């Protein structure tokens with residue numbers, strides 16, 4: 135159904151990797167050779183565009199935008215697209231986002247790869263699903279091989295890449311200083327309103343996952359770098375993909 | 382629509398301040414000169430009465446009662462009234478409630494002003510809202526100037542006023558001793574089932590916020606003063622308002 | 629309505645105790661003298677079978693299975709059955725489940741009775757209920773007299789019985805290592821996706837509650853005994869019931 139349309143649309147392009155673009159990274163859609171832009175509304179069932187082509191000399195699909203849980207209160211907003219990506223032969227999903235840092239040592243404009251997360255005030259996107267596949271193990275949701283490759287790519291470009299735990303809050307209002315003190319007490323390094331439900335759905339669909347946050351601000355109570363933060367992340371990603379033949 | 386009705390009803394009274402009355406304080410509606418009582422059912426859209434008149438020689442609207450999240454599972458129950466208050470020219474919202482104390486040093490009958498909160502098992506009232514106004518900063522949700530005035534008024538009446546962080550639980554069942562141990566570990570000073578969603582909505586609508594809890598009990602596992610607690614709070618409020626010309 | 633059917637079905641059997649059977653314990657339904665099996669679909673309103681008869685020489689109802697919050701997103705799934713049990717004259721509810729251990733000292737195959745719980749990412753089953761009965765005190769949700777009897781029965785059989793706090797996560801995906809570190813930091817000894825909403829509903833309906841988890845695994849990041857774990861629990865339960873005349 136959705137799979138059918140995209141297959142027609144893709145020239146017979148066969149990407150192994152898809153990238154969900156967070157705020158600040160929307161522009162990456164432009165640096166895509168032989169690009170094929172598909173609006174979300176053309177795609178039946180999809181909840182804002184899908185772009186497929188060559189990036190870093192390798193075939194990719196990008197989602198410019200995503201629907202967040204806070205928008206309609208639907209944590210499974212991204213279920214159908216993620217399923218569709220899986221059915222197109224994508225084996226790897228890279229998720230990017232904007233986040234607040236809970237660490238002095240990790241200022242705005244820093245990039246942090248996710249090694250784990252905490253679902254705090256989100257809802258679980260697999261509620262209402264049937265069959266035993268729903269009991270998804272999440273011990274290594276963030277693929278160890280991909281997390282290493284990203285680290286190696288950052289070192290090759292000589293960009294700092296932090297590592298840490300992302301805590302998901304529903305939003306859309308930001309956190310109070312007390313909620314931020316709690317988040318830290320609970321073990322998070324950064325907070326945000328996205329990504330986690332897509333990681334869960336990805337693991338449900340058998341996709342390997344990497345993720346990274348651009349730090350745009352310190353968390354509330356601790357008191358624009360979002361563009362250079364994003365250019366840093368893009369450079370790590372590009373380098374990561376060129377170095378990977380079978381990635 | 383709702384604004385229209387209240388404007389007709391209010392004699393051309395123009396309050397800057399509204400007070401949401403928690404359990405125990407319902408009676409304050411009676412000590413209101415030139416009072417104008419409006420039942421909630423007369424007001425179209427409202428989810429229990431609205432009372433406007435002179436209090437402490439100053440124009441006020443009071444909500445005797447509120448709809449809690451636990452009643453129908455609607456965290457935005459109070460959205461329409463709070464919006465309506467804003468549209469009537471109210472610039473300041475004072476929220477009162479009953480809460481459980483997590484501090485030995487803060488017994489039943491104490492009054493605690495809120496300097497911050499933690500939304501624990503509530504839902505965010507702005508889920509499903511559109512436009513960038515929904516990304517409400519909550520760094521100083523509890524107005525610093527109002528929190529000081531309340532403190533000064535308490536000292537002038539020689540009433541103790543505690544200060545602390547309120548944690549919101551959905552309810553309607555109370556917390557277990559283990560949940561109370563957690564609440565403290567997470568940094569709360571008091572717990573309850575109200576207020577926080579109205580603070581969020583208020584900040585969304587540009588209103589300055591003050592809040593205070595009457596402590597009616599210690600939190601579960603730590604083991605009637607609710608009336609004197611309320612009379613203490615009323616005395617602080619009255620004093621706060623008489624001392625403020627432009628409040 | 630549901631009460632009517634079960635009364636007809638029960639031969640005029642009058643159980644004081646009901647047992648909700650978790651994964652692994654379904655088989656206990658077989659060791660029930662004079663058994664009367666009733667499928668859930670025969671029972672009007674029920675959300676998988678109800679079995680009543682003699683167990684350990686005493687009259688009992690067992691629920692083989694339960695509907696979890698994660699299945700349809702309905703935390704009050706078990707409301708109607710629990711109410712129905714109360715209306716049949718059941719005064720005591722024993723809940724069993726599978727759980728993950730957060731303690732080295734409590735390995736897979738251990739049995740842990742619940743002395744308290746933490747509702748973490750569950751929803752409260754009493755949201756949407758009317759009347760003052762909904763404000764259920766939960767200071768001693770796990771009956772002290774029943775918890776002692778279970779302990780005494782374990783010692784008589786010479787089985788180890790741990791004691792601790794169960795934290796409820798919605799599921800259906802399992803917890804990340806970071807969520808497990810948090811659960812411990814918040815004071816839990818074991819985690820799972822069940823039981824807590826039924827404890828709340830039970831207390832709402834005036835039933836005394838005992839609960840126990842079979843430990844099937846360590847919690848994520850810390851790295852089959854579920855059958856012997858269950859046989860241990862069954863032995864404690866049997867011994868507990870034979871020793872109780874008025875239990």
Ligand code: HPA
Nearest residue numbers: 232233234325326327353
């Ligand atoms: O501090 C934050 N909190 C939540 N979401 C965010 N997205 C960017 N920064 C933040």
Ligand code: HPA
Nearest residue numbers: 479480481572573574600
């Ligand atoms: O201890 C409490 N818990 C929750 N709500 C409350 N409202 C008054 N006291 C309490």
Ligand code: HPA
Nearest residue numbers: 726727728819820821847
């Ligand atoms: O580790 C666990 N987590 C959640 N539910 C469970 N049920 C059995 N083990 C577990």
